[PDB]
Amino acid sequence: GTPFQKAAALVDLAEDGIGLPVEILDQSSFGESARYYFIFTRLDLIWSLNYFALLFLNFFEQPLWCEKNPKPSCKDRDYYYLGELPYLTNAESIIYEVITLAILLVHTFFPISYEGSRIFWTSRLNLVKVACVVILFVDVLVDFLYLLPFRIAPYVRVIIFILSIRELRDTLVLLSGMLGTYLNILALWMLFLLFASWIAFVMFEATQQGLTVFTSYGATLYQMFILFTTSNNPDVWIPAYKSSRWSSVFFVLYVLIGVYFVTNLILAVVYDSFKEQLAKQVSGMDQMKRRMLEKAFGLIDSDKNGEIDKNQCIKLFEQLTNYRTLPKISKEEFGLIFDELDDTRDFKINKDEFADLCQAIALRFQKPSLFEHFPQIYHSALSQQLRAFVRSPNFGYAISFILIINFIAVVVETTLAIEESSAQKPWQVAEFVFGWIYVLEMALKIYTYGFENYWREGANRFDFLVTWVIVIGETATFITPDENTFFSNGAWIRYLLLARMLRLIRLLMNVQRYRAFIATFITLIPSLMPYLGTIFCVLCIYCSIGVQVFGGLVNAGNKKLFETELAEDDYLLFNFNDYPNGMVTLFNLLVMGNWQVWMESYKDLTGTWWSITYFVSFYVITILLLLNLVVAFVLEAFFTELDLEEE
Amino acid sequence: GTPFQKAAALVDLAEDGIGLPVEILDQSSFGESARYYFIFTRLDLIWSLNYFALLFLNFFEQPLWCEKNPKPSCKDRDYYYLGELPYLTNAESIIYEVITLAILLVHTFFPISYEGSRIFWTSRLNLVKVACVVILFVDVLVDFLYLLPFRIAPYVRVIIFILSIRELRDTLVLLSGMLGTYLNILALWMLFLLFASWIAFVMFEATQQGLTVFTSYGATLYQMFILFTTSNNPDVWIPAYKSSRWSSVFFVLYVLIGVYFVTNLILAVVYDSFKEQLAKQVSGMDQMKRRMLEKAFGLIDSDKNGEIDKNQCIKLFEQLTNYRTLPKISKEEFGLIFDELDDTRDFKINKDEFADLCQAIALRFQKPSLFEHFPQIYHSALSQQLRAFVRSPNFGYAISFILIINFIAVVVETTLAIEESSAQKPWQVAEFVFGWIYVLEMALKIYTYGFENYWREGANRFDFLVTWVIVIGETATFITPDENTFFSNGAWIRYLLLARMLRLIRLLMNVQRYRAFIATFITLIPSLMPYLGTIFCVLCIYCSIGVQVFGGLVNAGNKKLFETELAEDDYLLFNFNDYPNGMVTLFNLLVMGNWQVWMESYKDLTGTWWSITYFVSFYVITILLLLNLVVAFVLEAFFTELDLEEE
Ligand SMILES: [Ca+2]
Ligand SMILES: [Ca+2]
Ligand SMILES: [Ca+2]
Ligand SMILES: [Ca+2]
Ligand SMILES: [Ca+2]
Ligand SMILES: [Ca+2]
C-alpha cells in the first residue's frame, strides 16, 4: 500500500465528508477499493442525471384520482382544469421506473465493493438509503403485480433525492437543530393570537361586527390569523368601522403591532437560530478537516523530520491529481502551489503549515498565445497600431456608441411591431450588419488577448456563447428568405428580438454603481441554491399531499365549487389536480397574494375544518421558516457587501 | 455677571443644542436675559399643548369642498360617507384660531427679549418661524375679511409643528441627506421596471394577454409596477396562464426577482444611507457638545489651576439646578455626583475628565421608609415573620396561584357572556374579593418596602396606578346596585371585563424568554417615536392634499363611482372626504392591503392619468423610504438585543 495513495484519499476526505472511510486506509487490499471508487466517481454525472430524472418523474405521473373511475375519464384535460403536460401510460411508466430503479440499485449497492462488508451495514445513512430503495422496489413490484390505499413512491423518491445531495442533508440537519427555538417562538406567536382574538371576541360580543365575523372564538381566531397575514386588512373590520369609527383604532393597533413587532421578531429569531446552527456545523466540519489533514501529514512523513521537501510533495500532487472531486491542477502549478504553501520560506512545509492545502489548491487562476507562431504578421505597423487601439480606453467608447446605435435601431424596429415582414427586411439586414460587427469585435478581442487568456475568465466564455448563438440565429434567418415553418414563424422573430434586447442589457454594466449590484446578485445566486432546493423539495412533498387529499374536488361540473372564492376570483386554473398545477398553486400561496382564497375554498369542498391544517402548516413551515431564511440571506449579503465598499 | 451662571447656561446648551446663544455669554446685562429665558421655559408644557392643539385643529376643520354650494349641503354625513367628528362653525373656528395664533405669536416673538435684536434676525430657524407665523396671520386675516384658490393654513401649521420639535427637524435633515442615494436606487428600480415592462410588452404582442392587459407600453408599465408589490399576483397573468402554461415561468421569474432581490436591495440601501446620516449628525453633535463643555470648563476655572476643587464644583450645581430642561438632582446627590465624576481619584475634576458631565448627572437613580417612626409595631414577632414571608420566593408562587384562580373565574365569567345580570352578581362579588385581595397585596408591598422605595421605579408606579384604577371602578360598580346610566350600562361591564383581562397579562410576565421580548418591545417604542411622528406628519400633508384634490368625488349619488373597484369591494367608507377619513385611508394604503383599489378608482373619478402621481409618490416616499426605515430599526433592535445574551 503506497502511503501517497492513502494521503490522497485522506485529502479527498478532508476537502469534504464524502470519501473513503478512515477504517479502510491501513487494511490490506487497498488498491482494489481505490480502483472501484475511482470508477464509481467517473459516473457522478450519470448518477446526478438519474437522480434528477427520478425526481422529475413526479411531474408526469398519472394522478391517483384518475386511477379510479370518474364519470368522465380524465383524458378530457379541460373538464378538471388540468393541462399541458403528457401522461405516461402503464408501459411507459413501468419501463421508466425500472430503468431508474436499476440505476439506483447499482448506485446504492455498489459501495459494498470498496467499503468491505461490515462497514457498509454499520452506517446510518447507508441503512436509510437501502431502506428507501427496498421500499421503492416493493412498491414498483406491487404496481407490476396489480397490473391500495395510496402510493408511497413520490415521498420515498423525494427523500432519496434529498439525501443524495450533501447540501440538502445539511439543510435538513440545520432545520432539525432550529426546530426547538422555532417552536418556542411559535408558542409566543400563538399566545398573542389567542389573547388578541379573545379580546376581540369579548369586545365585539353583541355588536354588528360580532354577529357577522367574530361569531365564536374559533371563527375569531381564524379571522385574526388571516388578518395577521394582512391578506384581508380592510375587509375583515368593515362592519366594525361602519358601526363605530372608533373601533378602527383597535384594529389599527392590532395590525401594526402584529405586522411590525411580531413579524420582524419571528424573522430575527429564525435568523439567530440558523446562524448558531451554521456556526456549530461549520465548527464540526472544520475540526474534522483539521484532524484529517493532521492524519494525512503524519502518514506522509515516515521519516519524522517534521517537514515535507520538494519531490515528496510533488509526488503527492500527481498521486492526488487522479480524483475528479478535486480542482484541476497543471504541471507548473505543482511548483506554484508548493511555493505558495510555504509561509516561513524554507523550501519545506510544516505540520501546521500543511493544514492549509484545501484552500491553497484552488487559489491560483492565473497564467502565451498561439498567434505568435508567425512573427511577420503579429509584429507589423498596422498590427501594432491596431493593438494600440484595442487597449485604448476609447475602444470602450466606440463599443458603447455602437451599442447606443443598436439600441435606437431595436427601439424603432419594435415601434413597427404591428406591420408585416414586408418592410422588416431593411431592419433585418441592418441587424445582420450589427451582429456581424459584434462578431468582428469578439474575433478582434480574441486576436489581441490570445486564446487561453480569452478562455480563463468565465464571463468572456458567456459572451463567446451568446455572440455565437445570436449570430447563427441571425444567419439562419437571413440565408433562408423563403417562407418556412422554422424561419418565417413569429416565434423565431420574437426570439431574435429578445436576443438583441439582452445584447442591449449589456450596456447597463457601464454604470459602476449598478454593475456592483448586479455582480452582487449574480455572486449571491450560487450560494442560495441549497435553500431554494430545500424549498423546492418541501413544495414537492406538499404537492404530493395535496394531490392525495384534494385530488379532484375542482371540476367543471361541481356544484359547491362555484359558491367558493376560488371560482369567483377566476383562479380555477390554480388548483391541486395535477403535479404542475400544485407547483404553481404553492407558488401563489408562496407569496401571500390572495392566499386565503384557496384556504377558504378547499375548506368548503372538503367539508371539514381539518383541511386548513394543510394550509396553516404550509404557511407556518414555508413562509415563516424558509422564506424568512432566504430573505435573511439576501439582506445579509447586501448589508455585508454594502459595508464592504465603504470599509 | 456670575461665571457660574454662564457655566450653567453652557451646560444647558451642551446637553442639547437648545439654549441661549453663545454670543451673549460675555455681554453685559446677563441676568435680564436669564430670567426671561427661565420664565419662558417654565411654560414649555403650555407651548407643547398649544402646538398639539394647532396640529389637531385640522381634524375638525370644515373641508374646502363644503365651502362651495353642493346640491345637498354637507351636513348630510351619510350622503358623502362622512362621520363621527364634529365640525366647528365659523365663530368657533375663528375664536380657536385666534387663541392659538395669539399663543404662538407670543411664543415666536418672545426670544427677542433674551437674544438681543440682531441675533434674533440672523438665524435661519427664526426667519422661517416668523415667515410661517406671518403667513398664518395673513391667512386668518383673509378668512376674517371674507366673512380664494385654496387654504394654505393646514400645510403652514403642519410645518410649524414639524419645526417646533427638535426630533422632527433632525429627521427631515436626515431625509434630505438621504435624498441623493434614494434617488439613485429609485433610478435603478425604474430602469428594471421599464425594461421588464418592455420585454413583457413585446413578448405578448398579439397574444390573448397582450389584448386585455398589456395593451400598450404605458399600460404594461402600470400593471408591472402594481405587480411589483404583489398586490394582484395571480390576477394580472391569468390570460397568459390560460393561453399558455409556460408563460407563467416568466412571471414567476419577475415576481421572485422583484420581491427577493429589488425590495431587499432597496431596504438595505435605505438602511445604509440612513446609518451614515446618523454617523455624521451624531459626530457633529458630539463635537459641538465637547466644545461647549470645554468652553464651560475654561470659563469656570479662572485660577487656571487645571482642576476644579470640591466646593466650587458643588456650588456649580446649585446654579445649574434651576433649569427645567436638566434632570432633577437632590441635595445629597451633589457629593455622589462629584465622587462619580472623579476617575483619577484626586478629589478634583480634570479638563478632559469634565467631558462626562451630561452622562453622569442622569445616572445615579439610587438611594429610608416612613414606617419606622413607630418601632414598637414594625419590629414585632408577627411583623418579622411577615417580612420573612414577603421576600420568600413562595410569595410570587402564591401570587401566581391567585392569578390562575382569577384566570379560571374570568374565563367562566366570559363563557356566560350572553346571560343577563341576574346570575352575574356572584361573579361580580368574586371579582370584588379578588380586586381587594390585590389591593391588600399592593398595600402590603408598600408596607414591606416603604414609600420612596415603592416609588423609585416606574413599573411599580404603573402597577400602583392600574391597581387603583381597576379597584375604584369595581367598587363603584358594586356599591351602587340599582340601575343607572353610568353603572348598569353594558359598556361599563365590558370595560370592567377588559380591565380584568388586561390584569391577567401578568401571568405571561413570568416566562423569562417571553419577558425579555416584551421588555424589548416596550423599550423600543420611546426610541421609535420621532420616526412615527414624521410618518404622521407626512400622512397629514397627504391628507390635506387628498382632501384638496379628491374632495367630494365619492358620494351616494355619483354615477361613475359604482363602476369602480372602490364601491364593489365596499370600501366607500375609506375615502378622502374628511380629514379622519384620509387618516384611515392612508393607513390602509400604508400596509399594501388591496392598495390598488383606491388608485384604480380615483384615477377613474378624476378622469386623468395624472392622479396616480399622488399614489405612486405616496408609495415611493412613505413605504419605500419611511416604513423600510422603521422596519430597519425594529430588525436592528431585535438583532442587537438577541446577540447581547450570547456575548
Ligand atoms: Ca471528497
Ligand atoms: Ca519528510
Ligand atoms: Ca517551514
Ligand atoms: Ca438645553
Ligand atoms: Ca479651581
Ligand atoms: Ca482629576
Instruction: Tell me if residue B307 falls in helix, strand or coil.
Output: strand
Query: Is residue A26 included in any domain, yes or no?
Result: no
Cell of A533: 432546493
The answer on B497 and B379 residing in a single domain is yes
Check the CA dihedral A262-A267-A270-A272 and report its sign: negative
Report yes or no on B614 lying in a domain.
yes
Q: Do A202 and B588 touch (CB under 8 A)?
A: no
Look at residues B538, B637, B641, B632 and name the one whose alpha carbon lies nearest to residue B590. Answer: B538
Cβ(A599)–Cβ(A504) below 8 Å: no
Instruction: Report the CATH number that the domain containing residue B606 is assigned in CATH.
Output: 1.10.287
Domain co-membership, B491 together with B526: no
CA–CA distance, B589 with B616 (Å, rounded to integer): 11
- Distance of CA A164 to CAs A41, A54, A108, A161, B444, Å? 14, 11, 10, 5, 66
DSSP B340-365: HH-SS-SSSEETTGGGGHHHHHTT--
Whether A251 is covered by a domain: the verdict is yes
- The three cell numbers locating residue A489: 414563424
The set of cell numbers assigned to A78 is 379541460
Residue A605 to residue A50: CA distance in whole angstroms: 39
- Cβ–Cβ contacts within 10 Å for residue A56, how many? 11
Claim to verify: residue B504 and residue B600 sit in the same structural domain? no
Q: Which residues, 6 or more positions from B253, have their beta carbon under 8 angstroms from its beta carbon?
A: none
Question: In angstroms, what is the span from residue B362 Cα to ligand 6's centroid?
Answer: 21
**CA–CA separation, A516 vs A603, rounded Å?**
48
- Closest to A215 measured CA to CA, from B498, B418, B504, B420: B418
* A-interface mutation test, from B215, B272, B498, B520, most A Cβ less than 10 A away: B272
Using an 8 Å CB-CB cutoff, list chain B residues near A77.
Answer: none
Domain boundary residue among A108, A132, A164?
A: A164
The SS3 call for residue B72 is: coil
Q: Helical H runs in B20-151?
A: 30-41, 44-56, 64-67, 90-109, 124-146
Among B255, B490, B646, select the one facing A591 at the smallest CB separation.
Answer: B255
Interface test with A, best of B78, B186, B517, B633 (most A CBs within 10 A): B517
Residue A28 maps to a domain:
no
Q: Is residue A584 part of a domain?
A: yes
Give the one of B233, B501, B635 whose C-beta lies nearest to A264's C-beta: B635
Q: Which of B453, B483, B510 is the last residue of a domain?
A: B510
Distance from CA of B32 to the nearest CA of A (A): 49
Query: Do strands A349-350 and A307-308 pair parallel, antiparallel, or not at all (unpaired)?
Result: antiparallel
- Cell 428600480 belongs to residue: B189
Asked if the Cβ–Cβ distance from B593 to A234 is below 8 Å, we say: yes
The identity of residue A78, as a single letter, is D
Question: Burial code of A378-397, b = ≥16 C-beta within 10 A, e = fewer?
Answer: eeeeeeeeebeeeeeeebee
Partner residue opposite A260 with nearest CB, options B498, B580, B631: B631
> In this structure, are residues A74 and A549 in contact, taking their beta carbons and an 8 Å threshold?
no
Cα A305 to averaged position of ligand 2 atoms, centre (Å): 5
Specify whether A211 is located in the same domain as A123.
Answer: no
Residue A479 and residue A553 in one domain: no
How far is A593 from chain B, CA to nearest CA, in Å? 6
C-alpha to C-alpha distances, B469 to B435, B475, B477, B502, B503, nearest whole angstrom: 11, 10, 13, 12, 11
Say yes or no for a CB contact (<8 Å) between A573 and B238.
Answer: yes
Same domain, A338 and A439: no
Specify the 3-state DSSP secondary structure of B283.
helix
Question: Burial, B473: exposed, middle or buried (Cβ in 10 Å; 0-12, 13-18, 19+)?
Answer: middle
Look at B497 and A260 and tell me if their CB atoms are within 8 Å.
Answer: no
Rounded Cα distance between B566 and B571, Å, is: 5
Quick one: B407 and B467 in the same domain?
Answer: yes
A592 contacts B252? CB cut-off 8 A = no
For chain B, state the CA radius of gyration: 32
A324 backbone φψ class: left, alpha, beta (φ>0; ψ -120 to 50): alpha
The b-or-e profile of A65-75 (16+ CB within 10 A means b, else e) is bbeeeeeeebe
Distance B538 CA to ligand 3 centre (A): 67
Residues of A in contact with B234 (CB under 8 A): 569, 571, 574, 588, 593-594
Residue with cell 449497492: A109
State the CATH number of the domain containing residue A354.
1.10.238.10
B594 to chain A, minimum CA–CA distance in Å? 8
Q: What is the DSSP string of A289-332?
A: HHHHHHHHHHHH-SS--SEE-HHHHHHHHHHHTT-SSS----SH
CA of A301 relative to ligand 2 center, distance in Å: 5
Which of B281, B316, B343 corresponds to the end of one domain? B281
Nearest ligand, measured from the Cα of B311: 5
Instruction: Give resolution in angstroms.
Output: 3.3
Q: Which three cell numbers stand for residue A243?
A: 358601526
> Is residue A392 domain-shared with residue A438, that is, in the same domain?
yes
Same domain, A474 and A565: no
DSSP output for A357-412:
HHHHHTT------STTS-HHHHSSHHHHHHHHHHHSTHHHHHHHHHHHHHHHHHHH
Residue A635 and residue A499 in one domain: no
| Residue B495 burial (10 A CB sphere; 0-12, 13-18, 19+) | middle
Q: Distance between CA B255 and CA B153 in Å, rounded?
A: 43
A114 and A80 in a common domain: yes
Q: Please list the residues that pair with B350 across neighbouring strands.
A: B307
**Alpha-carbon gap: A439 to the closest alpha carbon of chain B (Å):** 25
Distance CA(B293)–CA(B302), nearest Å, equals: 15
| Cβ neighbour number for residue A546 with a 10 Å cutoff | 23
Experimental method: cryo-EM
Q: Collect residues with CB below 5 Å from ion ligand 2.
A: A 301, 303, 305
Nearest Cα of chain B lies from the Cα of A266 at a distance, in angstroms, of 10
Quote the minimal CA–CA distance from B287 to chain A in Å: 23
Beta bridge partners of A308: A349
Q: Provide the domain limits for residue B491.
A: 375-510
- List Cβ neighbours of B150 (8 Å cut-off, separation of 6 or more): B64, B548
Pair type for strands A307-308 and B349-350: unpaired
Q: Do A635 and B414 touch (CB under 8 A)?
A: no
Q: Do residue B587 and residue A642 have CB atoms under 8 angstroms apart? A: no
Q: Which residue has the cell 369642498?
A: B65
A35 in a domain, yes or no? Answer: no
Asked whether the CA dihedral A92, A93, A96, A102 is positive or negative, the reply is negative
Tell me whether residues B260 and A634 touch, CB distance under 8 A: yes
Ligand approaching nearest to the C-alpha of B17: 4
The answer to whether B405 and B430 have CB atoms below 8 angstroms apart is no
Burial class (CB in 10 A: 0-12, 13-18, 19+), A403: middle
Query: Which residue of A248, A494, A631 is in closest CB contact with B260?
Result: A631
Spatial contact of B197 and B222, defined as CB atoms under 8 Å apart = no
- Identify which of B592, B583, B593 has the alpha carbon closest to the alpha carbon of residue B624: B592
Domain total in chain A: 4
Return the half-sphere exposure (C-beta side, CA atoms, 13 A cut-off) of residue B232: 17
For residue A177, being part of any structural domain is answered with no
Domain assignment present for residue A426? The answer is yes
Q: Give the residue from chain B lying closest to A573, CA to CA.
A: B242
Query: What residues form DSSP beta bridges with B349?
Result: B308
Backbone Cα Rg of chain A: 32
Q: Which residues of chain B have a CB within 8 Å of the CB of A193?
A: none
- B341/B520 Cα distance (integer angstroms): 30
Residue for grid cell 413607630: B374
The shortest CB-CB distance from B84 to any of A245, A276, A646 is to A245
**CATH at residue B385:** 1.20.120.350
Q: A214 to chain B nearest CA, in Å?
A: 14
Strand, coil or helix: B196 = helix
Is A392 in the same domain as A253? no
- Cβ-based contacts under 8 A for chains A and B: 158
